[PDB]
Amino acid sequence: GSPGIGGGGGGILDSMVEKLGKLQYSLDYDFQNNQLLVGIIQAAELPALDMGGTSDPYVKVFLLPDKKKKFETKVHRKTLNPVFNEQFTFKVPYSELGGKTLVMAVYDFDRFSKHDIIGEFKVPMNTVDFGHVTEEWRDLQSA
Numbered sequence: 001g002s003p004g005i006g007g008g009g010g011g012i013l014d015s016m017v018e019k020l021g022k023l024q025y026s027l028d029y030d031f032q033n034n035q036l037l038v039g040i041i042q043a044a045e046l047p048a049l050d051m052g053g054t055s056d057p058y059v060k061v062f063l064l065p066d067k068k069k070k071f072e073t074k075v076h077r078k079t080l081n082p083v084f085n086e087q088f089t090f091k092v093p094y095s096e097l098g099g100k101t102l103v104m105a106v107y108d109f110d111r112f113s114k115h116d117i118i119g120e121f122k123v124p125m126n127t128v129d130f131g132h133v134t135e136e137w138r139d140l141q142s143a
C-alpha cells in the first residue's frame with residue numbers, strides 16, 4: 001500500500017510461471033461403466049532441492065468439492081523425472097460430474113516432516129471434452 005513512486009522491477013518477471021516441473025495425465029469418461037478414468041503418467045523437470053539433491057515425488061488426485069479420501073500414486077524415490085503409469089477410477093455418474101473439479105498435486109515425500117508440495121493444477125469437469133481421450137502436459141502451479 002503506497003503511491004508506488006520507488007520500487008524498480010522485476011514485477012513482470014515475478015508474475016511469470018515459475019519452473020516447478022510439469023505433469024502428464026490422461027482423462028476419459030467411461031460411459032459404459034459410468035466412471036471417470038484418470039491416468040497419472042509421468043512428471044518432468046521437477047525442481048532440484050535447494051542445496052542439490054532430488055525429491056521423492058508422488059501425486060495426490062481427487063475431486064472437489066468431494067471430501068472423500070484422496071487417491072495417491074506410489075512414491076518415486078530420488079528422481080526429478082518420475083514415471084508413475086498409474087490409473088485411478090472415480091465412480092461418478094456423468095450427471096453429477098458437472099460442477100466438480102479434478103485436482104492433481106505433486107508432493108515431495110518425507111518420512112519425518114510435513115511433505116512439501118511441489119505444485120498443482122486443476123481440471124474443471126465443465127471444460128473437459130467428454131467425446132475423446134484427453135492427454136496433456138500441464139505446468140505445475142505454485143501453491
Ligand SMILES: [Cu+2]
Binds near residue numbers: 132
Ligand atoms: Cu482421436
Ligand SMILES: [Cu+2]
Binds near residue numbers: 131132
Ligand atoms: Cu471425434
